[PDB]
């Protein structure tokens, strides 16, 4: 439900497995996504005890909703490191208070 409401915040799931957050994840994510529009922030958060395909959440805050829509349309179903990425929106206010485990 929240994942279908367009905001400037994009959530990426399934980028890497649980316990597989590496140091280059932020740079690879942000530099590619800069082509949908200006990126303000890139946040990596790992939900403890979550399943392999849900555990690692990568958030991007774009400057504008139009960029975010482009990113969600292009990144959902896209491969990253052999994994099929899931892309959706995230509530801005929840993202900004670090409520990163909703939905």
């Amino acid at each position: 439900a929240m994942g279908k409401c367009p905001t400037k915040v994009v959530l990426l799931r399934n980028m890497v497995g649980a316990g597989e957050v590496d140091e280059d994840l932020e740079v690879e994510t942000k530099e590619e996504c800069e082509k949908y529009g200006k990126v303000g922030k890139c946040v990596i958060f790992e939900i403890p005890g979550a399943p392999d395909d849900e555990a690692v959440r990568i958030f991007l805050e774009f400057e504008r909703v139009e960029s975010a829509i482009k990113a969600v349309v292009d990144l959902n179903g896209r491969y990253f490191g052999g994994r099929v990425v899931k892309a959706c929106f995230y509530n801005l206010d929840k993202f900004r208070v670090l409520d990163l485990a909703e939905q």
């Binding site: 690879e28 590619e32 896209r78 491969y79 990253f80 490191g81 052999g82």
Partner: peptide, 6 residues
């Protein structure tokens, strides 16, 4: 690797 599309 850039892992995009790989």
């Amino acid at each position: 690797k850039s892992r995009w599309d790989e």
